[PDB]
Design a protein around this ligand. Sequence first.
Ligand SMILES: *C/C=C(C)/C=C/C=C(C)/C=C/C1=C(C)CCCC1(C)C
Length: 137
Amino acid sequence: PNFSGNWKIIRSENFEELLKVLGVNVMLRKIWVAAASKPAVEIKQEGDTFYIKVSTTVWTTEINFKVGEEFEEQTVDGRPCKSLVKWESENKMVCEQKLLKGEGPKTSWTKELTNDGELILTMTADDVVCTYVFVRE
Ligand SMILES: *C/C=C(C)/C=C/C=C(C)/C=C/C1=C(C)CCCC1(C)C
């Protein structure tokens, strides 16, 4: 259970479907998936304090949290939400998100390290689950 490393993608699933539920319309979804279905992820872990950097070609997102401590970040479609992370096993954590403003689909994410050394990220919007699978560089 050391999440730390520089992670690269081997697999991704249902990302466009996720964006549809989030209300991103067609041309935008098609364009987006043709250059954001290969983001890089960097994690530095310090106990249950996490630093996560997620980057495409021209955009980067910085997430900082302690497990069990409320913080702020964005939904996938760039919307301000309150977040809370909890452990579900030794190698898996879960985040529940609430919008600061307005209404929208219920969103969440999970992070899991397999024993094979795969980092599995899921993002969920109502009934849709998008899964990204990473290995270490
Ligand atoms: C523990 C790992 C976490 C919290 C990683 C979360 C990653 C995302 C929320 C990625 C979001 C993306 C966008 C917001 C737009 C570009 C496509 C993604 C998947 C990189």
